Amino acid sequence: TEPRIVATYHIASDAERIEQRALALAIEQSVECPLEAINIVGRVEDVAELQPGRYAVRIGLAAATAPAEPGQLLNMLFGNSSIQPDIALADVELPAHYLTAFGGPRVGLAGIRTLTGAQSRALTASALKPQGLSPAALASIAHQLALGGVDLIKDDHGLADQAFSPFAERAAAVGKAVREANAARGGRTLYAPNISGTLDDMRRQLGVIRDEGIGAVLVAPMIVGVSNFHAIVKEAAGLVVVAHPAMAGAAKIAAPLLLGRLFRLFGADATVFPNYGGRFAYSTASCLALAQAARDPFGKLNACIPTPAGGIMLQRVNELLRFYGQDVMLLIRLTEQASRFVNKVADYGQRE
Amino acid sequence: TEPRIVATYHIASDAERIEQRALALAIEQSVECPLEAINIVGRVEDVAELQPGRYAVRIGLAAATAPAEPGQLLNMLFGNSSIQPDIALADVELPAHYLTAFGGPRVGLAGIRTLTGAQSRALTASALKPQGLSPAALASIAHQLALGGVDLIKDDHGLADQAFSPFAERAAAVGKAVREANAARGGRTLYAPNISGTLDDMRRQLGVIRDEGIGAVLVAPMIVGVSNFHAIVKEAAGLVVVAHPAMAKIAAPLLLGRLFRLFGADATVFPNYGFAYSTASCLALAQAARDPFGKLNACIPTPAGGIMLQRVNELLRFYGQDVMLLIRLTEQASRFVNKVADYGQRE
């Protein structure tokens, strides 16, 4: 008897129709047949009331149907049900063999700490914006940020391979600028350029990263396909792999499960998400759960650093470090103001 | 002045906050900067009240930010905003150069008609289920379906490369069985096996399809990444490319109809109103798939649902005959196929 995947879904339904709805869900994410058309059919393990009108439903899905293949796993978890308006995928309990197969973060929270020199303090990141800029202007900005002691500099997630500032030219100009800053200040700032397109495009761009001696990379798994994201993770070669959540909301998969657990499972070393109280609508509950899914014990897998983003000002730093603890990377006269932020973070939870 | 992409979004907002929300939208899908941090910024071209609490917002996005690269285009259209709960992407008006570059369906509605032998009638499809059967048992089902004159046989979208029926073994067994059936009844039934995994996995599986002489392929673009779906379309070599909506808030007509078509889908599967799709949405999806769209071929809308013998005439009145309805197996199959063939002709 092979152990099942237990997926938890949240369903908007009545008490009258919830039992029926749950069975239909088991079918939809299994054989997708009437029973008359027929170990493989999904089992309704449990139905619980979260509150009136909203249920949690545990479904046992035959592992046979979903090999350790990211796309196919997602397919069996939520492929068809994603089209329904009354359902969200909330959590997934995978058999241990899935965790070993996928392998999780290759560098992880501990690895990034070592690379950046952040022993115990929280880390800092910034993005290169706006995307209209030439690689030189982007480079100049990166230089100022890195001069300020920021741990990780990432591309705007919108930056890809535009004539504006083609990937090759941008990675060179920026990576060069970050190195120079590191040398002058004795820094260990990382740069994560955004790789894009087909798997062919992504590997070519990874080629440039490696050739330029760049130490990190940014990828939006839900854009490029999780199966390809995972493939790149396996080719990353000690690079810090930073995941971005672009298009993660297109289907109703809960953020903590997706950006936290699944992204981590597939190989993300850091994972970007909109902080509560930022421009987006994540609850504090969700942000905390996301952080925990990224960090907490999960088989033998490395932790992934939660990387919150939003209106993160000098005034928010202590709040966020109280909220998240110090195992977090906060994403926010440039060099001066950057140093201000960096020093505020470093000073957290130590003697005045 | 290069023409902009004009994306239309639907927003849940009040009259007091809508103008502001619209501006923030324009920024979010553009520079994603405060203005203090800086023709790239998105332009709010128009704001209109659909119903109280619901606005349609037209945003002019600089084409330079979104090359003709499927993933990146989706990125700039809705990457970030897909995270927000108050917005949906409803339509997109692309500069003609986008249509030319992507190329649309290589076979199209006309081409599938020719391959299938369906001159003017609606077409028919069925899926191989349940998942978990051996390649031989799947093959046997395929044979019975094809014997009934069904135009296209697709893998269950859930079928991939599982141990119980590996892609190579399934494609061979099922492809053979469909050919047999064809030779026996003088048929032209197509088989579309589901390809998946990484782009490497997809090309290997595509290689098996071509080696087996199979005439179609099934792909879920939102699973495999639209950029890779489009890469496969360019390698499909005259195979009918059938899109499946697995993992598809982008409005269904825009995504399954227009965008899938744009990227190269020759047929597009979607849940019929008869899931939660409205009749309005199903009709619009059909139209997005079929109607004039630059010089691009039409993509055949392929509705799926509890489509029964008693539903055929309804659905053909609804969609017209440029449609492929998805749904003693041979006797009951033949009965569906003949019903479809008989629609809108003299008794």
Please check whether residue B78 touches A, CB under 8 A: yes
**Angle at which helices A167-185 and A135-147 pack, to 10 degrees?**
30
Residues followed by a break in chain A (C to N exceeding 2.5 Å) are 38, 332
Taking Cα atoms as reference points, which of B1, B256, B162, B4 lies closest to residue A82? B256
**Angle at which helices A199-212 and A167-185 pack, to 10 degrees?**
30
Residue position matching structure tokens 């098996």: B208
Contacts of B33 in chain A (CB under 8 A): 129-130
Q: Which helix (H) or strand (E) holds B226?
A: helix B226-233
DSSP assignments along B298-326, one per residue: P-EEEEESS--GGGHHHHHHHH-SS-EEE
Please check whether residue B87 touches A, CB under 8 A: no
Residues 6+ apart with CB under 8 A from A315: none
B265 DSSP assignment? -
Cβ B197–A71 below 8 Å, yes or no? yes
Distance of CA A195 to the CA centre of its chain: 15
Q: Hey, how many other C-beta atoms are within 10 angstroms of the C-beta on A83? A: 22
Header resolution in angstroms: 1.8
Please check whether residue A36 touches B, CB under 8 A: no
Cβ B72–A161 below 8 Å, yes or no? yes
CA dist B300 and B266 (Å) reads 6
Domain that holds residue A53: 1-102
Please check whether residue A223 touches B, CB under 8 A: yes
Is B338 strand, coil or helix? Answer: helix
Mutate to test the interface with A, among B77, B128, B228 (most CBs of A within 10 A): B228
Residues A212 and A310 in one domain: yes
Nearest chain B CA: its distance from A191 CA (Å): 19
Q: Hey, how many other C-beta atoms are within 10 angstroms of the C-beta on B258? A: 25
Is B271 strand, coil or helix? Answer: strand
Residue pair B124/B152 in contact (Cβ under 8 Å)? The answer is yes
Contacts of A259 in chain B (CB under 8 A): none
Please check whether residue B101 touches A, CB under 8 A: no
**Angle at which helices A317-324 and A284-295 pack, to 10 degrees?**
60
Assigned token pair, B226: 């639209």
Torsion of CA A167, B248, B198, A296, to 10 degrees: 80
Please check whether residue B91 touches A, CB under 8 A: no
Please check whether residue B12 touches A, CB under 8 A: no
Cβ A65–B24 below 8 Å, yes or no? no
Nearest chain B CA: its distance from A20 CA (Å): 15
Helices marked H in chain A: 15-28, 70-78, 96-102, 108-116, 135-147, 167-185, 199-212, 221-224, 226-233, 255, 263-266, 284-295, 317-324, 334-346
The amino acid sitting at B51 is Q
> How far apart, in Å, do the first and last CA atoms of chain A sit?
59
Mutate to test the interface with A, among B40, B83, B206 (most CBs of A within 10 A): B83
Domain boundary among B55, B75, B102: B102
CA dist A146 and A143 (Å) reads 5
CA dist A255 and A263 (Å) reads 10
Residues A139 and A7 in one domain: no
Domain count, chain B: 2
Taking Cα atoms as reference points, which of B286, B287, B291, B289 lies closest to residue B263? B289
Handedness of CA A183, A184, A189, A195 (dihedral sign): negative
CA dist A106 and A111 (Å) reads 8
The amino acid sitting at A156 is D
CA dist A125 and A116 (Å) reads 11
Residues A351 and A246 in one domain: yes
Cβ A250–B245 below 8 Å, yes or no? no
Residue pair B69/B11 in contact (Cβ under 8 Å)? The answer is no
The pair phi, psi for residue B343, each rounded to 5°, is -60, 130
Nearest chain B CA: its distance from A248 CA (Å): 6
Cβ A33–B130 below 8 Å, yes or no? yes
Mutate to test the interface with B, among A38, A128, A131 (most CBs of B within 10 A): A131
* The A87-93 sheet, strands edge to edge: A43-51, A54-61, A5-12, A87-93
CA dist B302 and A295 (Å) reads 44
Residues 6+ apart with CB under 8 A from B57: B8, B9, B10, B11, B22, B25, B44, B46, B47, B48
Could you tell me which chain B residue has the CA closest to the CA of A259?
B83
- State how far the alpha carbon of B133 is from the alpha carbons of A25, B165, B206, in Å: 21, 7, 22
Contacts of A69 in chain B (CB under 8 A): 160-161, 196-197, 201
Annotate B281-304 with b (16+ C-beta within 10 A) or e (fewer).
Answer: bbebbbebbbeebeebbbbbbbbb
CATH number (domain holding residue A66): 3.30.70.150
Taking Cα atoms as reference points, which of B301, B259, B195 lies closest to residue A75? B195
Taking Cα atoms as reference points, which of B244, B250, B152 lies closest to residue A71? B244
Nearest chain A CA: its distance from B208 CA (Å): 19
Residues B87 and B144 in one domain: no
Please check whether residue A65 touches B, CB under 8 A: yes
Residues A124 and A87 in one domain: no
Assigned token pair, B332: 């009951």
- State how far the alpha carbon of A7 is from the alpha carbons of A78, B45, B197, in Å: 10, 43, 21
Among candidates A62, A156, A250 on the partner chain, residue whose Cβ is nearest the Cβ of B82: A250
The pair phi, psi for residue B17, each rounded to 5°, is -105, -10
Is A107 strand, coil or helix? Answer: coil
Could you tell me which chain B residue has the CA closest to the CA of A38?
B130
Among candidates A33, A78, A162 on the partner chain, residue whose Cβ is nearest the Cβ of B64: A162
Assigned token pair, B168: 């190579």
* Residues in A 332-351 with any Cβ partner in B closer than 8 A: none
CA dist B55 and B77 (Å) reads 18
Residue pair A192/A242 in contact (Cβ under 8 Å)? The answer is yes
Domain boundary among A82, A102, A122: A102
CA dist A98 and B315 (Å) reads 43
The pairs formed by B271-275 with CB atoms below 8 angstroms and a separation of 24 or more are B271/A83, B271/B245, B271/B303, B271/B304, B271/B305, B272/B303, B272/B304, B272/B305, B272/B307, B272/B315, B273/B305, B274/B305, B274/B306, B274/B311, B274/B314, B274/B315, B275/A83, B275/A84, B275/B305
* Residues in B 277-316 with any Cβ partner in A closer than 8 A: none
Q: Which helix (H) or strand (E) holds A166?
A: none
Residues B178 and B68 in one domain: no
Residue pair B257/B289 in contact (Cβ under 8 Å)? The answer is yes
Q: Which helix (H) or strand (E) holds A90?
A: strand A87-93
**Angle at which helices B226-233 and B199-212 pack, to 10 degrees?**
30
- State how far the alpha carbon of A241 is from the alpha carbons of A33, A255, B218, B228, B229, in Å: 40, 19, 31, 21, 24
Among candidates A72, A158, A245 on the partner chain, residue whose Cβ is nearest the Cβ of B32: A158
Assigned token pair, A136: 């030189």
The two beta strands, B267-271 and B300-304, are parallel
Assigned token pair, A347: 């000073």
The two beta strands, A329-331 and A123-128, are parallel
Could you tell me which chain B residue has the CA closest to the CA of A27?
B130
Q: Hey, how many other C-beta atoms are within 10 angstroms of the C-beta on B313? A: 14
Residue pair A345/A324 in contact (Cβ under 8 Å)? The answer is no
Residues B109 and B16 in one domain: no
Say how many CB pairs under 8 Å bridge A and B: 221
* The B300-304 sheet, strands edge to edge: B190-192, B152-155, B123-128, B324-326, B300-304, B267-271, B240-243, B216-219
Report the 3 state secondary structure along A226-264: HHHHHHHHCCCCCCEEEECCCCCCCCCECHHHHHHHHHH
Q: Which residues pair with A219 in a beta bridge?
A: A243
The pair phi, psi for residue A47, each rounded to 5°, is -135, 120
CA dist B196 and A103 (Å) reads 21
Taking Cα atoms as reference points, which of B103, B132, B128, B77 lies closest to residue B249? B77
Residues B111 and B91 in one domain: no
Beta strands in B144-238 (DSSP E): 152-155, 190-192, 216-219
Helix, strand, coil percentages in chain B from 3-state DSSP, rounded to 5: 45, 20, 35
Assigned token pair, A343: 């020093």
Q: Which helix (H) or strand (E) holds B144?
A: helix B135-147
CATH number (domain holding residue A240): 3.20.20.110
Residues 6+ apart with CB under 8 A from B328: none
CA dist A250 and A74 (Å) reads 14
Q: Which residues pair with A54 in a beta bridge?
A: A12, A51
Please check whether residue B220 touches A, CB under 8 A: yes
Please check whether residue B182 touches A, CB under 8 A: no
Q: Hey, how many other C-beta atoms are within 10 angstroms of the C-beta on B3? A: 14
CA dist A276 and B95 (Å) reads 37
Q: Hey, how many other C-beta atoms are within 10 angstroms of the C-beta on A199? A: 26
Assigned token pair, B182: 């064809």
Q: Hey, how many other C-beta atoms are within 10 angstroms of the C-beta on B321? A: 13
Could you tell me which chain A residue has the CA closest to the CA of B40?
A132
CA dist B303 and B325 (Å) reads 6
CA dist A80 and B244 (Å) reads 10
Could you tell me which chain B residue has the CA closest to the CA of A247?
B79
Annotate B153-186 with b (16+ C-beta within 10 A) or e (fewer).
Answer: bbbbbbbbbbebbebbbbbbbbbbbbbebbeeee
The amino acid sitting at B317 is R
Please check whether residue A24 touches B, CB under 8 A: no
Residue pair A199/A70 in contact (Cβ under 8 Å)? The answer is no
DSSP assignments along A328-346, one per residue: -EEE--HHHHHHHHHHHHH
Distance of CA A41 to the CA centre of its chain: 31
Residues A120 and A162 in one domain: yes
Please check whether residue B235 touches A, CB under 8 A: no
Cβ B223–A198 below 8 Å, yes or no? no
Contacts of B24 in chain A (CB under 8 A): 279
Residues B54 and B141 in one domain: no
Residue pair B248/B222 in contact (Cβ under 8 Å)? The answer is yes
B254 DSSP assignment? I
B104: left (phi over 0), alpha (psi -120 to 50) or beta: left
Residues A218 and A269 in one domain: yes
Residue pair A182/A189 in contact (Cβ under 8 Å)? The answer is yes
Deposited experimental method: X-ray
Taking Cα atoms as reference points, which of A327, A317, A323 lies closest to residue A348? A317
Residue pair A39/A91 in contact (Cβ under 8 Å)? The answer is no
Mutate to test the interface with B, among A61, A75, A312 (most CBs of B within 10 A): A75
Nearest chain B CA: its distance from A132 CA (Å): 6
Angle at A286 between CA A222 and CA B90, to 5 degrees: 45
A275 DSSP assignment? P
Among candidates B72, B83, B84 on the partner chain, residue whose Cβ is nearest the Cβ of A160: B72
CA dist B203 and B38 (Å) reads 43
CA dist B202 and B211 (Å) reads 14
Taking Cα atoms as reference points, which of A187, A186, A241, A185 lies closest to residue A209? A241
Domain boundary among A74, A102, A130: A102
Residue position matching structure tokens 């709010």: B44
Residues A71 and A110 in one domain: no
Residue pair B167/B192 in contact (Cβ under 8 Å)? The answer is no
The pair phi, psi for residue A324, each rounded to 5°, is -95, -15
Cβ B79–A227 below 8 Å, yes or no? no
* Diameter over CA atoms, chain A: 73
Among candidates A71, A85, A247 on the partner chain, residue whose Cβ is nearest the Cβ of B78: A247
Assigned token pair, A189: 């700032």
